[PDB]
Every structure is written in C-alpha cells, then in structure tokens.
Write a protein that binds this DNA or RNA. Structure first.
Ligand SMILES: [Zn+2]
Ligand SMILES: [Zn+2]
Ligand SMILES: [Zn+2]
Length: 96
DNA sequence: TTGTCTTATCAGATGGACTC
DNA sequence: AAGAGTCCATCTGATAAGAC
C-alpha cells in the first residue's frame, strides 16, 4: 500500500524517498530535490522475461531486465537462462 | 548461524516534449 | 524564429536485502 506522501499517487515509474525517507513518486521526488519545496497539485533480450521493476539496456542498446543488466555489468558475461527465478521478489529497504 | 552473491530498490544523469 | 528553462519518464549508477 505504497503512496506518495505529497500527491497521493499509488503508481509511478520509480519510487523515491525524501531526506527523511518518506516515500514520493518520481515526479514529486525530482521536484522537491530540484526546487526545495513540495510539487504543487517490452521483453528482455537475454532471458526473454516481460516483467521487471527497472529496464536497462545492453551494449548494443536493446532492452534487458534489471537482473540481466546488473549481472552482465558485474561479470562481463550474459546471465544464464538457469538463473531466472520464478515469481516476483521484494525487499524491505531501510531508511537513509 | 555466519558468508557470498544476486538483484531489488534506492539515488543520480540524461534528454525529449513542452512552455516561456 | 531561436534560445533557455520546466517537467518528469527512463536511463545508469549506488547501496544493500535477503536468498541459498
Ligand atoms: Zn507524488
Ligand atoms: Zn518528508
Ligand atoms: Zn533478463
């Protein structure tokens, strides 16, 4: 039940936090950082997944999922198909 | 019960569409 | 007409949760 504490949006291409760790949508997060006040009111080339919280690009400029993109950056080799975990994983990130 | 490694989820950078 | 500024999606980079 995540919600932008400024505008009330429940959907956004990227969730962000303010200095205190209060959640803000991408729009309200960028605005506050820039202005210092409140904002006024596809599939992976490697593993063929259609679901990720963040699309990245490979060296040729084609889309890869977050997992595949990060794996390649680290290892300089493509993510093997056997690494692909079923389901969606989430993590409780702490403040600051 | 600790250590490693994958990769979610945060933060920063870039630039197209739009207004001024 | 031609430049600077606003806005915010979407990209790259940083941090670190928790799978295993
Ligand atoms: Zn918002
Ligand atoms: Zn706040
Ligand atoms: Zn992938």
């Amino acid at each position: 039940a995540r919600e932008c504490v400024n505008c009330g949006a429940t959907a956004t291409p990227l969730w962000r936090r303010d200095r205190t760790g209060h959640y803000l949508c991408n729009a309200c997060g960028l605005y506050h950082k820039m202005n210092g006040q409140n904002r006024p009111l596809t599939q992976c080339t490697n593993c063929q997944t259609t679901t990720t919280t963040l699309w990245r690009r490979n060296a040729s400029g084609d889309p890869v999922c977050n997992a595949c993109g990060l794996y390649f950056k680290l290892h300089q080799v493509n993510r093997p198909l056997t690494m692909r975990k079923d389901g969606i994983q989430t993590r409780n990130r702490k403040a600051s």
